[PDB]
Amino acid sequence: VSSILEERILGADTSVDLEETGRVLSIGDGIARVHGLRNVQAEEMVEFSSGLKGMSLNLEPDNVGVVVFGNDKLIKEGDIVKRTGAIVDVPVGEELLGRVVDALGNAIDGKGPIGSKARRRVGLKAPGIIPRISVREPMQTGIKAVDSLVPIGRGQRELIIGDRQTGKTSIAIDTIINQKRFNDGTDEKKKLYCIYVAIGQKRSTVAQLVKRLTDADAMKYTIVVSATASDAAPLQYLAPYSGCSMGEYFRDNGKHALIIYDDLSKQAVAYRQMSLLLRRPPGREAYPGDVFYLHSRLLERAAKMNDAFGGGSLTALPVIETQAGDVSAYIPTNVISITDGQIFLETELFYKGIRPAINVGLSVSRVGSAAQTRAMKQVAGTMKLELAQYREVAAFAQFGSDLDAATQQLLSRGVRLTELLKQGQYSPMAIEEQVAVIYAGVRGYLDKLEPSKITKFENAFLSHVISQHQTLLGKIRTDGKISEEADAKLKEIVTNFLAGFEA
Amino acid sequence: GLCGAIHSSVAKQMKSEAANLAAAGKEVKIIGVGDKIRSILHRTHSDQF
Amino acid sequence: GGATGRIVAVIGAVVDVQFDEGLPPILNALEVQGRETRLVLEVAQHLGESTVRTIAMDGTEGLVRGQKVLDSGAPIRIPVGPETLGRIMNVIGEPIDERGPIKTKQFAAIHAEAPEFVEMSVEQEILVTGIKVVDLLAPYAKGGKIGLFGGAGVGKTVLIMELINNVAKAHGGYSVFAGVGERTREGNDLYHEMIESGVINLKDATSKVALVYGQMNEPPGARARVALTGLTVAEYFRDQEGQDVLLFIDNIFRFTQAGSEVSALLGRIPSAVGYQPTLATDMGTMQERITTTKKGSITSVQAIYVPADDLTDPAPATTFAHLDATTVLSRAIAELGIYPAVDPLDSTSRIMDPNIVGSEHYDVARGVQKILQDYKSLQDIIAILGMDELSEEDKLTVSRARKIQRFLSQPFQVAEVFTGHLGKLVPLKETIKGFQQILAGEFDHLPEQAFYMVGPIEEAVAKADKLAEEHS
């Protein structure tokens, strides 16, 4: 009470000062033509007298198009618009961790104010060719399919593209839930601070998302940034730049950070609304020209930093939905063109039975084997080549073109590895169990074993290896490579377990 | 194959006579021609062909 | 209080009203005088000096240029309270059932803000609606938004009437039906059905459902504000009474389409296919207000037309984004004869999770979807060649798939005029048991004609036995 009194009466300066303003013309639909600001700078946070920010774009000789950060009822024609004096900025700290933060800095979750220290400009320039260095660290997701065919690098951007309702947000949350075991460990290089920018979603999906992360105890890497549907179109526009600025703070301090841009097409459609209300000419699908420049800034804010610049990395993974699987639409071609890694879900495998539904050969990671551990590189290259062989031989021998022993070998190993890559929702596993199970799948011992029985093989095999083989998995994950004694030991343990599986 | 419901009817008649010759007959060791007859008989009487 | 301004330009809804001294803020309700019925306009954009660009809700006929308009100075205040149950109103708040005015005490405004992130319910109890395809593949969420997509003549309205006649009996919570841009024939039939079924009561104050109708005869400004009307009625019954309300909004594409018509008149640049640029955020605010909160529960079933069966159209696409349980009431499965023609692949629900619905329901549902996806690939092969190119595995999958796909269909209570069967209310455990038996393959001898319009699986066994006996 009394502390509230004294903070209210000491905190506000009430330091009046002469200040540039300008009256307001047409306040249309969140856009306001403001006459008068002859010294406003382009893309600047400006302030409507009812207490609400707007961002000044589209500086014209008549007037400035300020697009508002919120509701439109609270603005009339003829009121003042005060210049704040600086570009729109995001308050970033490490005390911002584990707290849902509305798109500017405003933590709307009911857990007090944010204890920020480091304000940061949000429209910053990304690093050049010298401050960047290449991908080195293996960004693991816990998904067997991602970490064994399209592995991520700490230092990298990699799409999650699909159609609606396929498992893309679920892949992003598997990626989040994996990294708990690296945060609570010892190495700072393993530890994770991630930023989940939910663009244009609904508030109950973000609420149940925070429920899943709190129940999975995720709230020390995580920073959830919600610009939901009821938020204004510039809050949905500006939210992934805010998450990028928080990720750039962690990166330039030297902590391995990532950002999941969930539903990045909602940023594209909110910026389409903004351009068509500020009367810019429409381009293709009524999206304007610089949507590629928009996502190109947003996604080239991330690669590994130099060893003299802290060594912190950023992993941008944006989630994008197509419509009817049309990859040739404007926003998917732009966002595939800017990124390099991309994970393709076609959906017919989701209804066919593999989970997560990576339908695959469209998906590629350009950094490839450089972003794997040494064991997963030693095991899972022949798996990718075998899956390529399997897909093409099944595609022409759909009807039984020619079946020698080689073709039934290819279909057998392909179907068995297809049921290897199935994995339940919200259950990420570490890298050493993945090396163990893809060793049990690729290096023999599963080729003639009745493909419906692969899932019980998975369950009993993980139970076996977590039961009496924890120190050997410690040897595998800490030694890096899977050594030759560990190789023959995995051979012996999978043979013993094949006996105990036909027991 | 690629010829309709031929081998379906042949396999139906063959396994019907096999089930009729399962009771009170024992040696139902069989001979067959073509790939399609053994291909429709890899499962039910894969021993007896 | 009010401010008298002058109409100077008229297009439909879009009426440019000149204010020189008393210009009102955006989203206001200002009445045109000199009229038979009160012509409430809604202030949006101030464009020039004086220029409030209003949207006009009723008969634009007779609007002379330079006509006096009284600005009341508020958003569209309508009656709410327990005095609106069993009482029809339209978007101004006016009672259109000719029983008298609303005798309520307080007014609630049509325009409001969404509930914040600070207080949001995150619990998910399964709503079992007695329908096999719903309770198997996309089960509903008691306290989440439910959407019935589909084209024209696909059975959305019949499925809504099943949902009222099945779930609305259970919820003692006050229901709210909002008809937006649909047939006035259906609102009439629904009103007399609510009278006869005892859901409303014209002689007592113990009725259960409120009604708002902004049917398709209305000008676009009216139809752009009906979902807001019924939604702020149901939002009163959530907040300041604490009830577990149902919100049956048919057909939210009429809301979005009326927005597109008004915006084509409002002088905004056309977006993609022919809609407005504010399709994501206008529907965003309207859908974010339809939410279950800490203060009370909304279970909102809403029918969402798709134009020309395009699910890639922007309004159905963003409505797929704003939902918790979709149901794609397709048409091609009705060409095959299955009613409702619910595409179950493209229908999902957020609540299907083995840590929620149990392992048995999840395994049966994912097996059914697996068999139907394999059947879709095999029906490509069948449509070219024929069924004499498949192996034993493929033919058992095709046969089990046709058995399942016929067994998804059931006869409803409200659609007993079209079919012959009575209304089948299938419980949950019988749905799991029936589809589990058909999936495990204990019915490799019944015909597929015995699973059509059946209900429980014992009715399928009995229909096959009666078919064999009438062939005997």
Ligand SMILES: Nc1ncnc2c1ncn2[C@@H]1O[C@H](COP(=O)(O)OP(=O)(O)O)[C@@H](O)[C@H]1O
């Ligand atoms: N590994 C998995 N196992 C089982 N189900 C999964 C898996 N991954 C995703 N899913 C399914 O995906 C759905 C969630 O999809 P989501 O990621 O929300 O897509 P979108 O964000 O496009 O709506 C859930 O219903 C869930 O059942």
Ligand SMILES: Nc1ncnc2c1ncn2[C@@H]1O[C@H](COP(=O)(O)OP(=O)(O)O)[C@@H](O)[C@H]1O
């Ligand atoms: N369970 C059912 N049994 C038989 N016919 C049905 C069933 N459900 C819907 N229909 C058919 O669908 C039509 C109703 O569709 P409706 O939802 O009124 O169209 P709209 O989607 O344009 O409102 C009816 O003519 C009826 O023949």
Ligand SMILES: [Mg+2]
């Ligand atoms: Mg998503």
